[PDB]
Design a protein around this ligand. Sequence first.
Ligand SMILES: CC1(C)CC(=O)c2c(C(F)(F)F)nn(-c3ccc(C(N)=O)c(N[C@H]4CC[C@H](O)CC4)c3)c2C1
Length: 207
Amino acid sequence: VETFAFQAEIAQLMSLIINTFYSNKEIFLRELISNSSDALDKIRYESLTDPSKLDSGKELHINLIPNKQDRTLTIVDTGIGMTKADLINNLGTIAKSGTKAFMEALQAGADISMIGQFGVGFYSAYLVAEKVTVITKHNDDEQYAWESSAGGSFTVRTDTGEPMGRGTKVILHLKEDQTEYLEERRIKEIVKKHSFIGYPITLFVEK
Ligand SMILES: CC1(C)CC(=O)c2c(C(F)(F)F)nn(-c3ccc(C(N)=O)c(N[C@H]4CC[C@H](O)CC4)c3)c2C1
């Protein structure tokens, strides 16, 4: 397990997200599904010039897995996935200007629902989650686990767990007052209302 500090802009944004009383928290789901849709568009796109990129799985979909007992909502996709360098530094590098601009927009009176327009929609997870775990597998690398409960640090380790084939699992460890997002009728209504997604989105209903 390696521990890293977030870039200053991103730690400032996470501190603002984690601590905000911003009522419209439901936007987190459309943001995470949009990340999944962009990852599915990328792997589909790359497969048109190199069909072997789909040897790790041909199905292109999104799964929504609420878990009341564990207080977790998992977002699973079979997109391009992320490499070790994407998790530690490369996605954060591209996100730097977007993060700073989003915060300037918020200072100028803008709404937290604009987060996606700045390319940093992933961090909207912290509106409802006290900790986020990211399990990911890209074709050019090993399976990795990324994790952060904010507070300025994140960890990256090789994932010894169940092999994924290719894609990303975003595990939201929900805050005590945000358990409504584990309810089947709530997920359904949010997916219908806010969710632009040219891939099947399947809600796993709890037995
Ligand atoms: C690395 C992170 C842990 C922390 C981070 O900063 C961050 C950001 C960023 F804010 F930078 F935009 N976005 N982001 C994220 C989260 C899920 C996914 C998905 N579900 O695959 C994703 N896919 C990108 C991967 C690159 C491809 O070109 C396009 C599809 C990106 C994360 C996850």
